[PDB]
Design a binder for this molecule. Structure first.
Ligand SMILES: COc1c(/C=C/C(=O)c2ccc(O)cc2)ccc(O)c1O
Ligand SMILES: COc1c(/C=C\C(=O)c2ccc(O)cc2)ccc(O)c1O
Ligand SMILES: [Zn+2]
Ligand SMILES: [Zn+2]
Lengths: 176, 175
C-alpha cells in the first residue's frame, strides 16, 4: 500500500538554511546525433539553445537547452556560461563524438530493464492542441492523449527514444 | 566526428514557435526503490520540499513531487495544490512501485554504466566546497569530490538509489 500522506510527510525535514539558494538546474541525457536533438527540442518543443561547450580531449560536447528568451542570453562568453548554468530547469544534452555515424550504437531510455530514469515532462496550456501540432510535425508518440485510462495526458519520444510527458496542470485534478 | 561547430549547431536550431510560448520544463522522473530514504535525502540533505503526492491503488504506485519551493506557497486546498505543484518548473518526480523496498534482488540503474542514457540531475549552489563538507558529515556517498580528478570545483553525489547528482557553482564554472 505504499506510504500514507502523513507517513510520507513525517519522512521529510524542513530545509537547512545552508541549502537556501540551491536550485534544480539541469537534467542530463546522452544523445546519439546532436543535429536531430537540437532540431527536435527547439523546433518541436520551443526550447532555446543557451550554451554549447566542447571538450576536444575527452571528445564530447554539451548543449544546454531551456525555455528562455534568447534576447536574455548575454553577449560576453564568461557571463554567458554563468547565466546559462544558473538557469532553473535546463536540459543538458551530451554528445560523445562518433555516436551519430555508428549504426550499432543507441542509448537506453530507462523504461525497460534496466530501469531507473523514466521521462522529462513539459507543462503546456492544452495537451490536445499541443499533440495535434506534434502529430502534424511527424512526432512519434508513446501514448496519445486519449489512449489508455489516463485521458488528457500524453507521452512522446525524442530522436533518441527518451520519453517526454506532455501534461496540463490545470486539468490533472481528475484522477487518484 | 569532431562534433559540431558552433555554427553548424545554431543552424540546426529553430526559433520558438508561438504555439510553445508558455511551455515549461516541469519535471524529471526517477524511479525510487524506497520512498522513505528518498524523501529523507532530498528534503533533509538537499533542502527540497515535498509539494505533491499521488497514489494509484490499482496500478500499485505512488508519485512524489519534490522542488525548491517555500512550503508556505503551497496551496491548502487539494485541487489548487495539484495545479500549482504541476505548474512549477524544475520539479523532481519520484515514482515508487509498491513492494520494491522489501525486495533484496531489486535495484534501479543510474544510466552511467552499460546501457547508458540518462546521466544525472544537477543542483546549482553558491559554494560547492561548503556544501560538500556538509554532505560528508551527513554520510553522503560521493561519485566525485570537488577536487577529485580533472574538473576541480565540481562534485557528484549519489542519492539512495545511486542516481548521480552534480553539485556545481555557476560562477566558478569555465575554470
Ligand atoms: C554533463 O555535466 C557536466 C560535465 C560533465 C562531463 C562528464 O562527462 C563527466 C562524467 C563523469 C565525471 O565523474 C565527471 C565528468 C562537465 C561540465 C559541466 O558543467 C557539466 O554540467
Ligand atoms: C510518472 O509520470 C506521471 C504519470 C505516470 C504514469 C502513467 O500513467 C503512464 C501512462 C502510460 C504509459 O505508457 C506510461 C506511464 C502519471 C501522472 C502524472 O502526473 C505524471 O507526472
Ligand atoms: Zn551536468
Ligand atoms: Zn511524470
Amino acid at each position: 500500500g505504499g506510504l500514507t500522506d502523513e507517513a510520507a510527510l513525517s519522512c521529510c525535514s524542513d530545509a537547512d538554511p545552508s541549502t537556501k539558494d540551491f536550485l534544480l538546474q539541469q537534467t542530463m541525457l546522452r544523445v546519439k546525433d546532436p543535429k536531430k536533438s537540437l532540431d527536435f527540442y527547439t523546433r518541436v518543443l520551443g526550447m532555446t539553445l543557451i550554451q554549447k561547450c566542447d571538450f576536444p580531449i575527452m571528445k564530447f560536447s554539451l548543449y544546454f537547452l531551456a525555455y528562455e528568451d534568447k534576447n536574455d542570453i548575454p553577449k560576453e562568453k564568461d557571463e554567458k556560461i554563468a547565466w546559462a548554468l544558473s538557469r532553473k530547469a535546463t536540459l543538458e544534452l551530451t554528445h560523445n563524438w562518433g555516436t551519430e555515424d555508428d549504426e550499432t550504437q543507441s542509448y537506453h531510455n530507462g523504461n525497460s530493464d534496466p530501469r531507473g530514469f523514466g521521462h522529462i515532462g513539459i507543462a503546456v496550456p492544452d495537451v490536445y492542441s499541443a499533440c495535434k501540432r506534434f502529430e502534424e510535425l511527424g512526432v512519434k508518440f508513446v501514448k496519445k492523449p486519449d489512449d489508455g485510462k489516463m485521458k488528457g495526458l500524453a507521452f512522446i519520444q525524442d530522436p533518441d527514444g527518451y520519453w517526454i510527458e506532455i501534461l496540463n496542470p490545470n486539468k490533472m485534478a481528475t484522477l487518484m
